[PDB]
Amino acid sequence: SKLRPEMLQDLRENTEFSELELQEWYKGFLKDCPTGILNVDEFKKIYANFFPYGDASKFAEHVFRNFDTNSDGTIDFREFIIALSVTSRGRLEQKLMWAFSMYDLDGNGYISREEMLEIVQAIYKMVSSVMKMPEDESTPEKRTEKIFRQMDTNNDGKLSLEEFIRGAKSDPSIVRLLQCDPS
Ligand SMILES: [Ca+2]
Ligand SMILES: [Ca+2]
Ligand SMILES: [Ca+2]
């Protein structure tokens, strides 16, 4: 029905959403999902609005796994709203931290080529049908080639968090963003 005063204050501290926005999200989340529990099939349907269902399936599964921080197979409102807050309203530093953990498939603290390519392939499959791409990065192999060499500092075939944040900052989309710095 409505968020309790204790949960509302905990979510206030853990998100960048206002009290009005938090209450507005909770009713809509409960409307769109009566049980308060998002499974993979429902999550795939959300993503199916923006890109074709079959194409988006593999990447949608990987995102769902990162959303699910307690790894129990479902997403509650807290796990949804915190994950949505970081991705849409979080700082660039902490956005990349949330991203790093998604690429880290086994959960050791390192991104191998077997993991990095797998996520890149999943992005390319979803994107292919409506987005045209460049040319020197127009292959999942061409992409993972550019990434690892620009990031793997000590060349152990693995990517640490510190390598990830620094290496991603040279991305064209972030290059545009950094010119909008207030100071
Ligand atoms: Ca969960
Ligand atoms: Ca790993
Ligand atoms: Ca390394």
Numbering used by the authors: 6 to 188
How is this structure described in the published paper?
Mutations at positions T71N and A190T were shown to be critical in development of DYT2 dystonia. The crystal structure of hippocalcin(T71N) and hippocalcin(A190T) did not show any significant conformation difference when compared to the wild-type protein and they have identical crystal packing. Mutation site in hippocalcin T71N is located on the interface between N-lobe and C-lobe close to the area of interaction with peptides in NCS-1 (26), change from Thr to Asn strengthens inter-lobe interface by creating additional hydrogen bond between ND2 Asn71 and OG Ser106. Affinities for calcium for hippocalcin(T71N) (Kd = 93 ± 12 nM) was not significantly different from the wild-type, even though the mutation was located within the second EF-hand of hippocalcin. However, the cooperativity of calcium binding, shown by the Hill coefficient, significantly decreased from n = 1.4 ± 0.1 for the wild-type, to n = 0.7 ± 0.1 for hippocalcin(T71N). However, the decrease in cooperativity observed for hippocalcin(T71N) suggests that at low μM [Ca2+], hippocalcin(T71N) will only be partially Ca2+-bound which then could affect regulation of downstream calcium signalling cascades in stimulated cells. Oligomerisation upon calcium binding was also observed for the disease-causing mutants hippocalcin(T71N) and hippocalcin(A190T). However, the mutations significantly decreased the oligomer formation when compared to the wild-type protein. Disease-causing mutants of hippocalcin showed a marked oligomerisation defect suggesting that EF-2 and the C-terminus domain are important for dimerization. For the dystonia-causing mutants hippocalcin(T71N) and hippocalcin(A190T), calcium influx upon stimulation significantly increased to 51% and 62%, respectively, compared to hippocalcin wild-type.
